[PDB]
Design a protein around this motif. Structure first.
Motif, short mmCIF file in Angstrom:
data_model
loop_
_atom_site.label_atom_id
_atom_site.label_comp_id
_atom_site.label_asym_id
_atom_site.label_seq_id
_atom_site.Cartn_x
_atom_site.Cartn_y
_atom_site.Cartn_z
N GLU A 1 0.83 -1.19 0.00
CA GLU A 1 0.00 0.00 0.00
C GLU A 1 0.87 1.25 0.00
O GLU A 1 1.92 1.28 0.65
CB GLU A 1 -0.95 -0.01 1.20
N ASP A 2 0.43 2.25 -0.74
CA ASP A 2 1.05 3.57 -0.74
C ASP A 2 0.38 4.40 0.34
O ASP A 2 -0.85 4.43 0.42
CB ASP A 2 0.93 4.24 -2.11
N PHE A 3 1.18 5.07 1.16
CA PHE A 3 0.62 5.92 2.20
C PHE A 3 -0.01 7.19 1.64
O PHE A 3 -0.87 7.78 2.30
CB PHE A 3 1.70 6.28 3.23
N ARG A 4 0.40 7.61 0.45
CA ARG A 4 -0.19 8.80 -0.16
C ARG A 4 -1.49 8.45 -0.88
O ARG A 4 -2.37 9.30 -1.03
CB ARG A 4 0.81 9.44 -1.12
N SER A 5 -1.63 7.20 -1.33
CA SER A 5 -2.86 6.73 -1.95
C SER A 5 -3.77 6.20 -0.85
O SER A 5 -3.57 5.11 -0.33
CB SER A 5 -2.56 5.65 -2.98
N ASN A 6 -4.80 6.98 -0.52
CA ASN A 6 -5.63 6.69 0.65
C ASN A 6 -6.57 5.51 0.41
O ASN A 6 -6.99 4.86 1.37
CB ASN A 6 -6.42 7.94 1.01
N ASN A 7 -6.89 5.23 -0.86
CA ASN A 7 -7.75 4.11 -1.21
C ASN A 7 -7.13 2.78 -0.82
O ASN A 7 -7.82 1.90 -0.29
CB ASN A 7 -8.04 4.12 -2.71
N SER A 8 -5.82 2.63 -1.03
CA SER A 8 -5.17 1.38 -0.69
C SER A 8 -5.00 1.23 0.82
O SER A 8 -5.02 0.10 1.33
CB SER A 8 -3.83 1.27 -1.40
N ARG A 9 -4.86 2.35 1.54
CA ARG A 9 -4.85 2.30 3.00
C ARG A 9 -6.19 1.83 3.54
O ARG A 9 -6.23 0.98 4.45
CB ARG A 9 -4.51 3.67 3.57
#
Ligand SMILES: NC(=[NH2+])NCCC[C@H](N)C(=O)O
Ligand SMILES: N[C@@H](Cc1ccccc1)C(=O)O
Ligand SMILES: NC(=O)CC[C@H](N)C(=O)O
Ligand code: MET
Ligand SMILES: NC(=O)C[C@H](N)C(=O)O
Ligand SMILES: C[C@@H](O)[C@H](N)C(=O)O
Ligand SMILES: C[C@@H](O)[C@H](N)C(=O)O
Lengths: 423, 134, 93, 340, 151, 527
Positions: D139-147
């Motif tokens: 998960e990317d921390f900047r991509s909130n959807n994957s969080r």
């Protein structure tokens, strides 16, 4: 001179109703049925040519297992052995087996495995326990099954053949099951029987039971003795017997249990089918005494048919009804019985019994539904009853309305039975 | 004809024809020894059930002269092998029990056809069965 | 929830946890969330109260606010609408 | 219709209107089975538009059996999930596997037959496999959807783990199993409290963190009533502090959960100040009878026979200190205050 | 009152109503002079059927759902002295009883065909071996070769 | 030396019947969604007129007509109507109020469904004495001289059905399930409402199954420990359940997947032979029809033991319907006699049709002709006085469709002399059926006309043998009719047009086939 082609050109409903009354007796060398041989002031007694000596020396020791029973009047046997060459190849006989298998085992009953002439061939027995037709399984699949199973695969599979120990010796049980083991024909058989004319079973019964799991097409199990009913198909309170019993996986498979000839099923306190949790039907064939307050009746079974019994107690529904509407039995019989015969009561005759019924006007439509709930509480979800030949029911017979309608209960041989009240 | 319904129901059809075979052997033995007289020769003899001489000693003497006095004046000498003779006298005791049961059934059949002769006195044949069993 | 004087034995606990496995269903599953005790002689329902209500709640949300809502859904809700509607970038049209 | 209801069922719509949502779900099952798709696999022979359509119906059918499970009450009798097999893109099928495992666990609530040990062990092996699958989702921390994706997967697999070890504790009382229940309860707390410290506070609004926290705080309160332990008491204090800090968008259900936790807290005081009786094999206590009647009241409320009698016309329905303490406690803290 | 059984040739047979309600098909047809066509039955065969019903008005037959009372019932003396006819006209009586759903005529009129299939001579079973084909000639040769040794 | 194709062509009739006369004719509603309107201002001013058009005494005359002439239809569903006069009184009391409880609006929807049934089953002579022609034409704006028998009673029946549905939709009936929804649909199902809206009736029936199985009642026998109100409640619920299975089986097809009927009347199952035969006799005669019409779409022969069992239960229910009470002083007894006798004639015809097709037993063609004449003799007998409206029940439309389609199919290939006179008789009967069936009667006449022109095409083109199988234009046209209606009853194309921007992409005889499909298209029977 009978004409076979003119018979086989007329359509199949008439041929069914021919071979339904021709019970299984394809031969003219039938034994006399055992009702005239006893109703007689005479005993038929013997007293032998050039050709018959050849048949009784060469043909007869092949068939000496199942046909030595008929040594009285051996004109029967030297009439039989000229049928025995050609009757199994007959077109009428094969047409009877075709319209049997096309109507799913209804017409003539229960082809049987046997081992004669070293082949493990099928056999058909009539009601007088005489073989008439013997087919090996390749010939039976070839020229009767495949003559009616052209292309639909829901009819190629032949799974109605009985097994029927006590027909044959336990060594022949072992040899038959060994030859049946070396082929993949356990799915071919459809039902087994049990004979043996405390827990001491015979060798053939153990040999039958120890391969009973291997069927995967088994229904319709049956026994024939009171000293054998208690040992494998009654629960009896036994909860742990690893060997010699009937392998709980295969208790789930069967559809009915036939109980052929006994004296009582409730020899102990309770004749419980707590297991066999998947059977739908049960037929009591010639048991002398049965008590309907002593059977436990599994969670979803439908038919309890029963015939040729000598004494029935009943489910004693009346003793629970008289607690409900709170009367005495004489006052109940005098006041709350209408005996209605509108038109469906007069459809099926019952000219010997008098069919009675409670009052629509003197019971106020609730404690009427409670009086019906008593009956459905004592039956526990059965429908088909079918009282054939009986005598002297102890309690009065109580049948619910929803089951007495649609001909779902049916008293057939009404001689000593009387006064079936319908609530 | 009151008791004929529970008389056929007491047996299988197979067992009833076996029993009729065995007492047909018995009545042939009684006619060749003329215990009961034959009606005529070169004709189908039809003896009644009203006058059939049946007793304990007649059944047992039939059992002697057929089952256990194994004379066979040309084929006596096939009793050498012990396993074959064991199977053969197991067959003898099986047919012994079956002929005793068949003639007991013949007595039960003849007592309803008004024949006051057929009283079996069954402890005698039970002693004979226990003797051969021992 | 159990299977005279006082006692200190612990036969109550094994049958009591099996009773929790029924209480959890009938309280925290069915009774708390999936039970709405209704009454039909007391409930009002027509089509004059709610029609102008829906008119007001659709005239309330202006045009450019809806695109900010859809941008929030596209950027911050990707694990919910993808099971149902797939891609919400196809839904801007 | 099916897509709109599967969007609406990601909120608290199936709890503010449960009977309306059950009728909408019956219409969605009727509309989905209308198309008669018996296989959701992309076949090579068809049109590549129809293969994308069958992929779409597969990923809608997964979410639809999920919302079929999450409304499995007695007020929803028509099922879709019966036409699916069992375990006994590639991230939506993960939620499907976890929810199906949750269904295979929670089907043993209403029935009386306790599950075998081999069944729970096979669920445990599959649980460890899907725990490894969830812990491998990058998960990317900047991509909130994957969080939020990883939060949903990790919270669902933690809920299934907690329910599995709760069934271990209840149905068999395996040695060293209460520690695993306390461990996964602390995992659930450390997932929910973590969302307050990352400015992603809307993660705690998904309806699984109401269901899961309801089950957890009710079981920990029910266990702190009868079997005391210091770790269970600290866990109960953490559950109460977390229940007080769930988001306000739940509204009435949160306050009713606080009421239910408070009622099971007062029931502990009633268990302490009243001494247990016996009858040799049967045990008597007022807490036992109050917990009997808490089921009996709601089984009376979810009995739709009275609405049937009201619907068929003019038929009107014509219906020591032990009992004193029971009636006073039921008058003070009634169980019918969690209803709406 | 009276009904009319119109035959297949065209004649009209006035039968009493209680007699002609032996036929289940007509007794169900009456639930609407009441004529009714019987298309595949000649006048003589329908006359024989009506004479059967005229005799067996008063008799009592089994319940049409039996194992013992329907298979093991003997034919009447009148029914055996009634069907001593041509064989093709016997099968036409059975066809008439299967059309009109007269079950006891299909009972006693068809146990006669059962008594004719069994009880026949074993010589003319050997004679009627492949009157319908039922076997390849290779299998016919094998079957006749297997029992060649006796005769 | 005969026609050898005929068995494997009757086996094709068993599929053509299902995909034309069952599914394609009555249960197919081809709707586009970019053309169909959707509004709550059109219907809220139209149903207001249809609720203001009825008056008080006219509604009580409708209820008197129901109490005197329709007791075989509502009494299973709503019970005796003497309890419902109070509900009509309370509807005309509560007409002017502005706060309606849901327990009032369900009874309003139920009595408007009863009014729909009364309008559908009323003769035109009794209808003209109650209502007035001219305000309806001054509102709707159509051809002025369009009296009730000329196709206007159907319009008022459909609009009363739609007003009963609008009053159901004011209940928020999805959010408040109650047995009055099931009762209102079981009243509306005795009309042609399940055939004017074959996709709305399936969804209302799914809501009625959800409403019924909400109660979780499986055993309708009143137990010993029941409230004496609850016992009569479960008895009435059992009558509603078997009426619901009866009106639930008749809408089976590809557009109705969730079925309630799960039991068997011959030979797992759940819920049968526990209930007293009072008006489950209407169900027992339809499960005995389900055991025949489950082999239409299925591709295996029914076993002959099953057909003999069905024949035996046919004879048993013949003697049971002749065992009913002769209440000639109530006119609904003759209508219940007609229903429970026409159903057994229908199942007898289907039984001997399947004997003729699958097995060719003793005189089965003559039995098909005989029970076709029995169906004709039941329908023509109702053309007398006081019982003219008996031919409006939808089972006679279903049965006459099946029978005239099979006789028109069989006249093509078998040159017979009794089948020809029978077909002339059914053509005269179909041109004399009641006009309240509407467009379905004209489509049945069109289908019979198409099969007659296909007979004329059969004699024209010589049959082309090929040894193993035959070839003819008639065969290919009959193959293609099923393929066209299976293409029309496949909702995958509306799914591709629904998911978003997805676009759907996929000699001597062919000329005659395409000319016959262009002149007499099979898509005319859908609309
Ligand atoms: N002589 C023949 N092979 N006849 C059968 C022809 C095949 C055809 N399908 C039938 O009918
Ligand atoms: N149905 C017939 C003729 C046929 C053959 C091939 C195609 C279409 C029709 C046989 O087969
Ligand atoms: N139906 C039949 O059996 C007769 C015709 C068949 N083709 C033969 O010959
Ligand atoms: C029709 C079928 N295909 C033939 O003929
Ligand atoms: N099914 C077939 O192919 C049979 C073929 N129609 C002949 O005639
Ligand atoms: C039955 C049919 O297919 C065959 N060809 C003949 O007739
Ligand atoms: C064989 C042929 O004549 C036809 N199919 C019949 O059967």
């Amino acid at each position: 001179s009978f004409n076979p082609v003119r018979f086989l050109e007329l359509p199949i409903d008439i041929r069914k109703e021919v071979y339904f009354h021709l019970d299984g007796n394809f031969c003219g060398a039938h034994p006399y049925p055992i009702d005239i041989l006893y109703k007689s002031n005479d005993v038929e007694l013997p007293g032998r040519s050039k050709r018959s000596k050849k048949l009784l020396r060469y043909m007869y020791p092949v068939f000496a297992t199942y046909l030595n029973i008929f040594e009285y009047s051996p004109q029967l046997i030297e009439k039989w052995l000229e049928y025995a060459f050609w009757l199994r190849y007959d077109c009428l006989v094969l047409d009877c087996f075709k319209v049997n298998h096309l109507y799913d085992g209804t017409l003539i009953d229960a082809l049987e495995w046997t081992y004669l002439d070293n082949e493990l061939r099928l056999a058909y027995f009539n009601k007088a326990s005489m073989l008439e037709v013997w087919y090996t399984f390749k010939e039976y699949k070839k020229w009767v099954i495949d003559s009616v199973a052209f292309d639909e695969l829901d009819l190629l599979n032949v799974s109605n053949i009985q097994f029927n120990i006590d027909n044959l010796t336990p060594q022949l049980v072992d040899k038959c099951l060994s030859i049946l083991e070396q082929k993949d024909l356990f799915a071919t058989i459809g039902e087994v029987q049990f004979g043996q004319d405390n827990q001491l079973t015979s060798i053939s019964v153990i040999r039958t039971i120890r391969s009973m799991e291997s069927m995967k097409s088994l229904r319709k199990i049956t026994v024939r003795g009171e000293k054998l009913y208690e040992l494998l198909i009654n629960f009896h309170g036994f909860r742990d017997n690893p060997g010699k019993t009937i392998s709980y996986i295969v208790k789930r498979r069967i559809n009915e249990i036939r109980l052929s000839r006994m004296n009582q099923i409730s020899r102990t306190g309770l004749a419980d089918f707590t297991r066999w949790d998947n059977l739908q039907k049960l037929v009591l064939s010639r048991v002398a005494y049965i008590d309907l307050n002593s059977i436990v009746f599994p969670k979803n079974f439908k038919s309890l048919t029963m015939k040729r019994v000598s004494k029935i107690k009943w489910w004693n529904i009346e003793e629970n009804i008289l607690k409900e509407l709170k009367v005495d039995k004489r006052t109940f019989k005098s006041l709350y019985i209408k005996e209605d015969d509108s038109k469906f009561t007069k459809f099926f005759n019952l000219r010997h019994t008098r069919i009675k019924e409670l009052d629509k006007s003197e019971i106020n439509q609730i404690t009427y539904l409670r009086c019906q709930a008593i009956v459905w509480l004592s039956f526990r979800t059965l429908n088909h009853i079918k009282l054939q030949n009986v005598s002297e029911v102890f309690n009065n017979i109580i049948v619910p309305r929803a089951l007495f309608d649609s001909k779902r209960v049916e008293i057939y041989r009404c001689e000593k039975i009387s006064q079936v009240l319908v609530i | 004809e009151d008791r004929f319904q529970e008389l056929v129901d007491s047996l299988k059809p197979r067992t009833a024809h076996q029993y009729k075979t065995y007492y047909t052997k018995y009545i042939q033995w009684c006619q060749l020894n003329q215990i009961i007289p034959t009606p005529e020769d070169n004709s189908v003899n039809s003896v009644p059930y009203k006058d059939l001489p049946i007793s304990a000693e007649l059944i047992h003497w039939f059992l002697l002269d057929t089952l256990i006095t194994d004379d066979k004046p040309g084929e006596k000498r096939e009793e050498t092998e012990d396993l074959d003779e064991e199977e053969e006298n197991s067959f003898k005791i099986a047919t012994l029990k079956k002929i005793i049961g068949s003639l007991n059934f013949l007595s039960k059949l003849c007592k309803v056809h008004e024949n006051p002769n057929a009283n079996i006195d069954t402890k005698y044949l039970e002693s004979v069965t226990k003797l051969h069993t021992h | 929830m159990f299977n005279i004087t006082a006692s200190s034995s612990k036969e109550y606990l094994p049958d009591l946890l099996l009773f929790w496995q029924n209480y959890e269903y009938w309280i925290t599953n069915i009774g708390l969330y999936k039970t709405k005790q209704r009454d039909l002689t007391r409930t009002p329902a027509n089509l004059d109260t709610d029609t102008e209500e829906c008119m007001f709640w659709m005239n309330y949300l202006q045009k450019d606010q809806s695109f900010q809502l859809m941008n929030f859904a596209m950027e911050n809700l990707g694990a919910l609408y993808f099971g149902s509607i797939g891609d919400i970038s196809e839904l801007y049209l | 219709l099916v897509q709109a209801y599967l969007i609406l069922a990601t909120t608290t719509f199936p709890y503010d209107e449960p009977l309306l949502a059950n009728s909408l779900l019956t219409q969605c099952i009727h509309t989905f089975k209308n198309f008669h798709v018996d296989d959701f696999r992309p076949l090579l022979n068809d049109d590549p538009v129809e293969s994308i359509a069958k992929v779409t119906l597969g990923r809608i059918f997964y979410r639809l059996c999920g919302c079929d499970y999450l409304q499995s009450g007695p007020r929803k009798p028509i099922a879709l999930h019966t036409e699916v097999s069992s375990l006994l893109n590639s991230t939506e099928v993960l939620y499907w596997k976890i929810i199906s495992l949750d269904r295979d666990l929670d089907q043993y609530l209403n029935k009386s037959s306790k599950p075998p040990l081999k069944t729970l062990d096979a669920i445990r092996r599959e649980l460890d496999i899907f725990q490894y699958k969830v812990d491998s989702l990058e998960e990317d921390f900047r991509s909130n959807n994957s969080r939020f994706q990883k939060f949903i997967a990790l919270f669902q697999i933690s809920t299934v783990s907690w329910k599995l070890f709760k069934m271990y504790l209840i149905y068999y009382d395996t040695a060293d199993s209460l520690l695993k229940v306390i461990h996964y309860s602390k995992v659930i707390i450390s997932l929910i409290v973590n969302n307050f410290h990352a400015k992603s506070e809307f993660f705690n609004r998904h309806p699984m963190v109401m269901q899961t926290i309801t089950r957890v705080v009710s079981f920990i309160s029910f266990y702190q009533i009868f079997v005391e332990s210091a770790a269970v008491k600290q866990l109960l204090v953490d559950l109460t502090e977390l229940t007080a800090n769930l988001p306000t968008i739940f509204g009435s259900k949160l306050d009713k959960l606080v009421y239910l936790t408070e009622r099971l807290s007062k029931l502990k005081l009633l268990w302490d100040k009243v001494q247990l009786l016996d009858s040799g094999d049967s045990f008597y206590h007022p807490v036992f009878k109050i917990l009997q009647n808490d089921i009996k009241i709601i089984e009376l409320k979810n009995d739709e026979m009275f609405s049937l009698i009201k619907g068929l016309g003019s038929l009107v329905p014509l219906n020591s200190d032990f009992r004193t303490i029971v009636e006073e406690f039921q008058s003070e803290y009634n169980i019918s205050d969690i209803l709406s | 009152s009276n009904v009319v059984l119109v035959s297949g040739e065209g004649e009209r047979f006035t039968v009493d109503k209680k007699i002609a309600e032996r036929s289940l098909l007509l007794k169900n047809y009456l639930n609407d002079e009441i004529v009714m066509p019987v298309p595949n039955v000649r006048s003589s065969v329908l006359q024989k059927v009506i004479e059967w019903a005229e005799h067996h008005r008063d008799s009592n037959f089994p319940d049409e759902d039996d194992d013992d009372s329907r298979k093991s019932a003997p034919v009447d003396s009148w029914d055996r002295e009634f069907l001593k006819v041509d064989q093709e006209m016997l099968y036409e009586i059975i066809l008439a009883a299967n059309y009109l759903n007269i079950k006891p005529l299909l009972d006693a009129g068809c146990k006669v065909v059962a008594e004719m299939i069994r009880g026949r001579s074993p010589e003319e079973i050997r004679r009627t071996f492949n009157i319908v084909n039922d076997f390849t000639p290779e299998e016919e040769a094998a079957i006749r070769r297997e029992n060649e040794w006796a005769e | 030396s005969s026609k050898e194709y005929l068995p494997d062509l009757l086996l094709f009739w068993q599929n053509y019947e299902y995909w034309i006369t069952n599914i394609g004719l009555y249960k197919t509603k081809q709707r586009d969604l970019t053309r169909t309107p959707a509004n709550l201002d059109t219907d809220t001013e139209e149903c207001m007129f249809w609720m203001n058009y009825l008056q008080k005494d006219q509604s009580f005359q409708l209820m008197n007509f129901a109490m005197e002439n329709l007791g075989a239809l509502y009494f299973g569903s709503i019970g005796d109507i003497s309890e419902l006069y109070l509900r009509v009184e309370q509807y005309w009391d509560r007409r002017a109020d502005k706060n309606h409880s849901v327990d009032g609006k369900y009874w309003d929807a139920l009595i408007w469904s009863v009014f729909t049934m009364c309008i559908y089953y009323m003769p035109v002579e009794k209808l003209a004495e109650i209502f007035s022609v001219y305000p309806l034409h001054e509102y709707l704006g159509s051809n002025k001289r369009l009296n009730w028998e000329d196709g206007m009673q159907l319009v008022m029946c459909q609009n009363f059905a739609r007003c009963s549905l609008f009053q159901l939709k004011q209940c928020d009936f999805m959010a408040h399930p109650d047995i009055r929804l099931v009762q209102a649909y079981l009243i509306l199902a005795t009309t042609t409402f399940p055939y004017d809206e074959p996709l709305l009736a399936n969804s209302l029936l799914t809501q009625c199954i959800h409403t019924f199985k909400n109660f979780h009642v499986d055993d309708f026998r009143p137990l010993l420990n029941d409230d004496p109100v609850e016992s009569i409640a479960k008895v009435t619920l059992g009558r509603i359940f078997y009426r619901l299975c009866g009106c639930d089986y008749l809408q089976s097809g590809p557009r109705k997947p969730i079925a309630l009927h799960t039991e068997v009347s011959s030979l797992n199952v759940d819920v049968y032979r526990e209930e007293n035969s009072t008006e489950v006799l209407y169900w027992k005669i339809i499960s005995l029809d389900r055991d025949l019409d489950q082999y239409l779409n299925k591709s295996s022969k029914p076993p002959l033991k099953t057909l003999d069992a069905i024949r035996r239960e046919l004879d048993i229910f013949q003697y049971k319907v002749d065992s009913l009470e002769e209440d000639f002083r109530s006119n609904n007894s003759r209508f219940q006699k007609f229903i429970a006798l026409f159903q057994i004639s229908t199942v007898s015809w289907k039984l001997f049709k399947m004997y003729l097709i699958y097995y060719d037993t003793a005189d089965s063609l003559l039995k098909v002709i005989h029970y076709s004449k029995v169906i004709i003799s039941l329908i023509v007998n109702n053309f007398h006085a006081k019982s003219e409206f008996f031919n409006r029940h939808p089972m006679v439309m279903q049965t006459i469709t099946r029978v005239v389609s099979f006789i028109s199919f069989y006249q093509i290939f078998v040159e017979s002399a009794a089948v020809k006179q029978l077909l002339v008789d059914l053509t005269e009967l179909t041109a004399n059926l009641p006009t309240i069936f509407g467009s379905k009667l004209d489509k049945l006449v069109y289908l019979t006309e198409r099969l007659s022109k296909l007979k004329l095409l059969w004699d024209k083109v010589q049959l082309l043998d090929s040894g193993d199988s035959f070839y003819h234009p008639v065969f290919k046209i009959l193959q293609n009719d099923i393929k066209i209606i299976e293409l029309k009853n496949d909702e995958m194309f509306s799914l591709i047009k629904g998911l978003g921007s997805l676009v759907p992409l996929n000699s001597d005889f062919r000329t005659i086939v395409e000319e016959f499909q262009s002149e007499y298209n099979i898509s005319d029977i859908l609309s």
